[PDB]
Amino acid sequence: SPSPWDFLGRVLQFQHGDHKRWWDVLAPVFGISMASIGYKLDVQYRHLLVLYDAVIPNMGPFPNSNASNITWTSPFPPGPLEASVNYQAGESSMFRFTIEPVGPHAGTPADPVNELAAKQLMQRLGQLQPGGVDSTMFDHFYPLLCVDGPEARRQWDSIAHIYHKCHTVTALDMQRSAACTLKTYFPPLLRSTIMNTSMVDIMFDAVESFRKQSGLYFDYTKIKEFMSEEKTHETMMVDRSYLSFDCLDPAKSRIKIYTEAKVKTLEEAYSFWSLGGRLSGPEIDYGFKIVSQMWDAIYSKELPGGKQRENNHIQINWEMSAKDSSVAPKLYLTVIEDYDAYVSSAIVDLFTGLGWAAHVQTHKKIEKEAYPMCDANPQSTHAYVWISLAYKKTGPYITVYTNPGASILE
Template structure:
């Protein structure tokens, strides 16, 4: 047996353990890169490890793994704040994502395409929530500016427009603080990244609730009006009106406090708008009504898509809740996508699975992928799942999985995204 002598590299911060020949990119970088704080290192150990599992499990090149792990270390982890403790009592800025957590990671699966790893973060500064920076005003845009060093085509026109029209600035918040301070979650901007092997795309989520509290304009109207103020494309506006008319109806079950929208940080002609609403859906008939916008969306594409929604619905509905209480509804976030390329909005269903046994998600994903004949994708999903659980010695009752989303289009066919919450792995 050969004994490998441990060596060190002399660096500005002192002696660092040299990487071993078989180390993965996450291990190599962790042995070489400095950390600004204990939380920075803790995030690297948790989020960095899980990101490595996802990139490796979906067969990203070694070069892409290094590039995105370096981006995570140098730009993203420093703006996640402290690693949440189990009770979330150490968080000064209440986050919008999941169960008050600042990040999530997901894999998007589409027929005839390589799986795509996605990151979503709620970036915050050290003064977020204080008198100096009550609405966390500056960090999201500053992060995007930093990212242009890696991806020069990030376009700021839409970000600046919706920032001015949908969210509340520090100055406005100070003038309306009595209204604002009562609302616990003040987060208004989420950034999300689709990581391709050689490049990435960015989209921003805007949450209009706080702006709504100070203006008296409901969140959906703020959203629709903000899109109309910058987009004059008749195709987009026609599709937008279908969703507007449906959600404005007296029978709408949408919850205003979970209304938000997203857009690509691209030039206006190439961007997509997505509107999200949440609902406590009590039957598959109600789910079908959301999916079809009350019958406004028709055709084979819509029906084939809902077959997948129905499959997930049946599995989740028949699964017992950990609380032991009878199931009365399934929380679903509905999304409709608009772009100049389609005269009709494309629906997507996000099954919110925070309060489920984690075993429900593998069962639902396995059933769906087997139904679609996605044997390779199923193997990929299981590989990532096993790596993530084994890395932190987790059991199957922790809340690692947060969402499963489903959509369908004639061009893309079915596409499914499985979301995980790295902050749950404490």
Template sequence: MSIARVTRRFEMQAATCRLTKTVSNSFLGELRLGPPATPVPGGGRRSRPQANGSFDPRGGVARQDTRDFWLTLPPAMDATKGRHRGASDRKEPSHLATPVEQEHGQRLISQEEAHVQFGRRHPSRFLTAKHSDAAMPGATTTAAATTDVVSQTHAQGAAANGSLDSKASKLQQPLDVVNSVIRFHNRDHQFWWDKSGPHLAELLAQARYPKADQYSELLFYALHVVPELGPSPDPETGDMRWRSPQTPDGTPIDFSWEWGPGGRGVVRTSFEPIGPLAGTPADPANARETDAWIRHLDAQGLVSGLDLQWYRHFSAAVLPSDVGRVRLDDKLNFELAPQAGTFVTRDISRRGDPMVKLYMFPGLRAQALGAGVSNLDVVTRAVQTLPPDQLEHLNAGPLLDYLHEAATRWGMETGIFSFDLVDPRASRIKIYTRAPATTVEYLLDALSLGGRYDLTAAYSPEALADVKDFWRIFIGEDAPDVMPSGGKERDGPGFYFTVGGGKPASAKVYISPMSFCRSDAEVLQRLRQYFSTRRDAEDMLPQMDNYERALKNIYGTELLESHVGSHFYVSCALQKDQLRIVTYLCPQILAQETAAREARKGQQQQLPQE
């Protein structure tokens, strides 16, 4: 069946199918079709919980959780052929419905039925859904299979009735479809999905992802990211046990848009996994949740090509062995996302498999080691203690030498260390830095690694002109050569340096618009100014229109024009003949919740007192 046909069928929803779940420890987990059943009173059957332990690299089990997710079908619906059965050919399902399910006219399809009817499709995709390690053999299905289940059930079932439900025909957007089949039982999960799911859906749609990919990514986000975003703010006071300094307002999730060729963007998600007890005496430092999430991906086979060799090495070399010994100052609290020192991203690739990247904050270990140890010292030692063959292949020596020079020359500071969770020979490391300098001299020095690389030999004159223009457009002509001290840590423009994969080191620019723009509308104006004066303006301006439309739909014109913070970084990287541009977006969930709460208080104060 073609993707287009699957997509059309998936859109024709008839409001007869629901995905529901049973979860212990408030975790939403991997998709399970027809889990192993045990009898329950009343003739129904209930799944046997499966424990899923997450291993911590420094020893011990990070958490135990049990995850179930049910797919229910309308009564007497044949999942194989999508037709209603008559009384003469009706078959009893292998898992009898519970009294509640009987009351609502639903039935469960069995693990065997799901496996046989819908098969193993696209095993390399992120959304492969499995039982835990203790699950029965052969109990594997995929999101693509789930798409077929829902689409065939609704589309063919409705066709058998001779017409489509008028309301279902209006469910044209993937977010509407996913909302019609997913239901959260946890208030925190529902909050984060309601507030951030539409953001991701809008970006995917305006980036022109195929609808089949939009369904897949939204389902993955709902199943495997939303449950990791931690407790939601108190609806009355706004209090949160855990705020992430990863974004300006503390929202634990952000999105980015890479400006790709052909008018199509590439969307990424980045988030800090937050445990349900983060910020409480039971888990004051949120010290295990990132590891638990990565181990969950690995144990469930959710990421094709996932390799944890460097994860184990750098966890031991970059993170503090005892986070409780670290004394956090204001600078660390601002720079570091989780106090445990990690957050993760995943690229929603248009080619090949999505990739997971891990980000670590060496400042925690540097502080724990005492005076005289810098973040760069921690990173250098971690890299230099790699196995000799991996260190030689990485060829990070020239980059590390330059970073030590730039620390003296420009006051450059190392903030974040990152790497890909793939085979070490294909993986790359990234080192994020910033300095208070704003001059073009500083720009060219960083791009050439202090003159170690000849930029004119590697890049065209047009590409070098582009990067200078980008720098001037976003920093502005009136910026001081050196930013004043005492400002926000994000003030100065920075670079992240990438090396690995058999390629020489390269530098990418990132700039915080909050330091140089008055509003997000001004950021959009400067982006349009840049793209409209490039050689490929004809290709990029339609994408600019789509991007601006997405942001207006997400934030609203009033918010974009009144403040800056939705864009918290704009970035560019030199390529042979042009720049690769990336914009980083904060959903502003907590900021908007605060504004709404203050507005309600103001309205209540204006009410006449009795």
């Protein structure tokens, strides 16, 4: 038995070489993750073909060793920003991967703000499954949060200082049902920098615009209050925020506010998780229990080269539902610098404390098969990128975000 990625790399014809290389790098990772999760073979085939047609052509050039060909500058390494494997208790794991759609010539004068890649990707996703990509929220939030090509090109003197000119990021939720639902992120840093406004008063103003235009109830009050305070900006890198929404029926879609932060103690972490105490209840408590566990399990150890932790880098997503007024957080703990060995051990011990034997097995399976550099290289710091904790009435919701192109950093 050949596995779908091998057989497909053998038979498939690729428009470009960089697509072939991105395939050789990721398709193993994605396919092994999907197969260890428990996907059916035809779903592996469908999602790998989606990746081959829709995604890979909208990843950008492949990094040669000196990364000379990569003209679309970014602080993150090229490729999918992450590939995620969800872990709940009772509900089945799901594979995801978010990608900043980069065009083949983005960063160059021909496509200096990469306007088409995300739209080409949305188009391919809609064509491979008609009626699966609803652009009702995309089309409302695009003029408010995102900058078209023309604006960014005539408002260039205003943004040419920005390093990462990202304006939209697509997160595809590859489902066990072969349905690849999309999820678009809009970082308004470009738009705010052009209009000289703030991320808060633009993100949330657009959210309220969509509220009144739809009648859907997206209560952003808690989040605006918190993110508008002083001691939050004290640590918050508000310029690394973005608004996320599911490209679905706005009634059944969700909106999420995201921001980064460099905290030093669990009190600031609870500040972000809780929105300054404005969010409480049993779920906040039971969630921060696990956040604290993983905090003092991961950030309690040595970094490579014997360096010291200046601070703890975190990220946070607050999800607001359409029919409710609830806001639910999701805290990222960044481990780009940690030992993949230490991160994996922490994840495993957490899962065991939760009683998740099946999930530790799945985790180590994906680890050894898709990410061989954790077992081969005892000082690897490339596979794991973030770990995300969220708590729902179902129970915990942990989410290990790995780098699929970790084979490129080794």
